Amino acid sequence: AGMELVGWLVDKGITSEKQWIQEDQASYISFNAASNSRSQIKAALDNAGKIMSLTKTAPDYLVGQQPVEDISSNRIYKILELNGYDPQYAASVFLGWATKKFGKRNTIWLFGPATTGKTNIAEAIAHTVPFYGCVNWTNENFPFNDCVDKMVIWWEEGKMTAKVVESAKAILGGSKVRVDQKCKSSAQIDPTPVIVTSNTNMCAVIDGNSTTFEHQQPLQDRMFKFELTRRLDHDFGKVTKQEVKDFFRWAKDHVVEVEHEFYVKKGG
């Protein structure tokens, strides 16, 4: 119906024609059944996307709209239990994290070895959302260049530095900050749930030829830490976006009180 598509694209979280085809070819063909308007398709995709990135949030897409029958086979549910965490408890911190419920503690850190699935979970979540940012650090100058107007920020590797830590603490803590880009333009990063993935200590800040833990406690106050040790190995497979969607839906239908602390407990 003209540009009635813009409401649909936003609902499905579709941001590209190619993605549209791959996830729901049938509808692509259905909407364009009586002419394939280059110009119309383009402006719909653009309008959507502007609408998603500027006024929508992580929960609108991470929280699956379908009831979850058996969560026991969900790869995120497994890996949590495997490493000794109460699934339903861990789930609640994730849901609250995605929701900006624990103000300040706006970051989830998955610490552990290379095959423990930390990267497997983080990546599935970042890709489940319409817009996500990756904290580079290859650009030590502007490491947060890709963090504006995103629904999730994935901190995949590297180490903060003395010159960036003040900004880092704000993003990690969920506080609005402006990241000066000299003449060009000072970008503004709004509160965004951040997920960190590392095998090293993320609280250790590099300051030239020395490393410091001077910021350790402030950094620790903004995170929920998980420790993953059980090596999973091939055949476990990659957690899927659908699995991401069910986990958060399950977490919402079985929400328990969460302890506002750095180390996530394992009881249960």
Beta pairing, strands 187-189 & 177-179: antiparallel
What's the CATH number for 1-56? 1.10.10.950
What number of other Cβ atoms are within 10 A of residue 88's Cβ?
A: 17
Are 1-56 and 57-268 in the same CATH fold?
no
Instruction: Please provide the size of the chain in residues.
Output: 268
The ranges assigned to domains in the chain are 1-56, 57-268
C-alpha to C-alpha distance for 101 and 55, rounded to whole angstroms: 18
Q: Which CATH superfamily is domain 57-268 in?
A: P-loop containing nucleotide triphosphate hydrolases (3.40.50.300)
Strand (E) positions, 151-193? 152-155, 177-179, 187-189
Asked whether the beta carbons of 229 and 116 are under 8 A apart, the reply is yes
Asked whether the beta carbons of 106 and 174 are under 8 A apart, the reply is yes
Full strand arrangement of the beta sheet holding 152-155: 132-134, 152-155, 194-198, 107-111, 223-227
C-alpha distances (whole Å) from 38 to each of 3, 17, 41, 43, 45 are: 13, 11, 6, 9, 11
